[PDB]
Amino acid sequence: DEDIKFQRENWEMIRSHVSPIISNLTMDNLQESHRDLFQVNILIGRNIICKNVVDFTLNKQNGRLIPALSALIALLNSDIPDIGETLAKELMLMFVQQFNRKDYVSCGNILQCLSILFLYDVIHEIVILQILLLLLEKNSLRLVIAVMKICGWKLALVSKKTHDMIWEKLRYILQTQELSSTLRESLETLFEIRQKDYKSGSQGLFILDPTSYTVHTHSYIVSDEDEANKELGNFEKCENQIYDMTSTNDVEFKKKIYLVLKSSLSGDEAAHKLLKLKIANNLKKSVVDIIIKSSLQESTFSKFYSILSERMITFHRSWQTAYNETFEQNYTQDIEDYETDQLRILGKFWGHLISYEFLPMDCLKIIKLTEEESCPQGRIFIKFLFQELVNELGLDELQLRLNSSKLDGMFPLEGDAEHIRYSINFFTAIGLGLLTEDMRSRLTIIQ
Amino acid sequence: SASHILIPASDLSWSKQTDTGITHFRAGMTHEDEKLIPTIFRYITTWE
Amino acid sequence: SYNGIGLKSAKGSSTSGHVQRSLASNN
Amino acid sequence: PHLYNSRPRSVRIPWYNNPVSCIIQNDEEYDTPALFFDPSLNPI
Structure with a gap:
């Protein structure tokens, strides 16, 4: 039914x-x-x-x-x-x-x-x-x-x-x-x-x-x-609503930060002002970029920005992530613009951060040296990076840190002879080359 | 104006001895509304 | 609290004697 | 003042401590009795 x-x-x-x-x-x-x-x-x-x-x-x-x-x-x-x-x-x-x-x-x-x-x-x-x-x-x-x-x-x-x-x-x-x-x-x-x-x-x-x-x-x-x-x-x-074609809103904050930065003698009172602002986690990325962009106008590097970034790191891990992410952003995306001069600022500015371990060091792994993929401007950047990083360690501690830092893509032991020729030839072009012995062995091993 | 800044105040009794670092900041100069002002030592490169 | 930092009093120092802890160096 | 502070002069004695008042009163209801066991107290 x-x-x-x-x-x-x-x-x-x-x-x-x-x-x-x-x-x-x-x-x-x-x-x-x-x-x-x-x-x-x-x-x-x-x-x-x-x-x-x-x-x-x-x-x-x-x-x-x-x-x-x-x-x-x-x-x-x-x-x-x-x-x-x-x-x-x-x-x-x-x-x-x-x-x-x-x-x-x-x-x-x-x-x-x-x-x-x-x-x-x-x-x-x-x-x-x-x-x-x-x-x-x-x-x-x-x-x-x-x-x-x-x-x-x-x-x-x-x-x-x-x-x-x-x-x-x-x-x-x-x-x-x-x-x-x-x-x-x-x-x-x-x-x-x-x-x-x-x-x-x-x-x-x-x-x-x-x-x-x-x-x-x-x-x-x-x-x-x-x-x-x-x-x-x-x-x-x-x-x-209205689409925003203008960052002028962000330009205000940009001038507030840059103005905080140009005031403040020493560096260690400027970290105080910046941390004092209690920046939302969203913006704490860009604030770094403002710092460094300003540091490139100074016409010469200053210990100021080093001690500033160092006092800013140790306070909260969000600034750890900030400087790491900005390191990748700079080296990867943004290097192609800078002239060989500003590279002299960046090289040392990251040198002081790496050599004292705040960065930390393994984050250098992004760098890869190939004729195919490299920037000659970036090449100069690396040159200033290690040439600063040596003077504080003295080429002694350097070999220990590197050998213990398991840098692979930059220091190939696996093969690809010509690349090893480029690495060794490069560090011998810097004027040091004493990091290349372990690779020099692998030249004779390949031949 | 080079005088605004902030002035490290740290520990009168100890700073006679250790060089404790900068633990505190006394207010350098004042205002009604703060604004900010740049100070010379920032615009002249250090000797090094 | 006044821990021994600051000035004996702010009179001739022309400042406001306003002291604040430094967020900079702690750890 | 005399203990932690080296070389005091013209200092006075602070009065130290008081009994720690337990006073408990009700401003809420007018018709709560005068003597009542307030939930703040322990149950005994």
Whole structure:
């Protein structure tokens, strides 16, 4: 009978949409999950949606997910109060079943769920204070104290005095009464929190505005006899701007930095001003470029910019990354512009950084010497780099650092004779060449 | 104006002994709004 | 706090006697 | 002043310590009683 077929296969599809939507609910997916859920026929499946949300909450695989499930139920209760009403009936009845069973786990689950539904104004604080009064007439205090941790902020706002009275009763037991040691300590801790104020207990998924929740605050009491329409969980047979071409904005900041730089005697007070500005991580790349561009105007290198960059490095690793990235940017992209003079500035300026290890040294690996790929201007750059880097180390420490720095592409031992001829011939063209002996051996080994 | 800068203030009692370095800066010269001004020693290359 | 840095007082020094820690050299 | 400070002159005695006031009061509700156990206190 193809209407009974259609309506059954539609009911089945609705159930198997709702189940995986509930199973894929999280904070930061909740609003896409709620869209999808709203595109299912929630009203026809009202009991199917209630039973999946309860059974997921209650599966105790969750419990952590109770705040998420409560936020989903809050959204849905603004849309369709009849659904949130149904879900709150069954959850009350599940709490009272688990209390009477003495199932402490399902007490803890369902009580935490009622707590967060009250946090989201789905249900009235009356139900919480009645649950807590019932609990506190027996011990059950592990239950009562978890509940009060998870509602107790909202209870203090809405109903200070009743809550206060309960605390007085709760307080009364601890000071003048005998209790099991494990139970008491948890009981005391809640007492500690009251002085603390619950400041690890007011954080979550408030993803409806206090007027966009159409605030159907359902006034249940946990001693009604209620309905819970399990039967709606059967199958049945329903016969029913401007583009920016100008950096002038960045030009302002450029003049502010350059002006900070031209003031400030010594170097060590200029680092103070620059670090004082607290530059956002985005810009701390370019500020370096301003520094060096300025250093190229000075017509001669100065220890100033060296000690400046050194005092700037050691403060924060973002400046490490800054100078490294700018080293690659300079050597790779930007060298082709500079005349042989400004190269005399750059060579020493990076020499002081490398020889004292601030750079660090292995970042020299970018350099590769080939007739095919090199810049003669860049060649001069290397010349000044090592000719500065020697004078501080003295060609002694140089060989040790290099030999321990595993520079490969620059110092080929693997083969390619002609390249080794270019390397050795090059360092002998610098006027040093004493780094090339190990390669000279490989010449005779190749021949 | 060569006097704005900032002046290293470090540790009167110790700087008689170690040369502690520059641990602090006393304000060199003042203003209503700060702005900044360049100072000569920056515009003349060092002897070295 | 005045730790022994600064001036005995700022009167004849013409400055503001404003002292501030140096972010530059620490580690 | 006499301990850490070498060669003091014309210095006075600071008065040192006080009891560490525990005073606790309620400005919030007028109908809270006068004597009430404030959640700040420890549970005993």
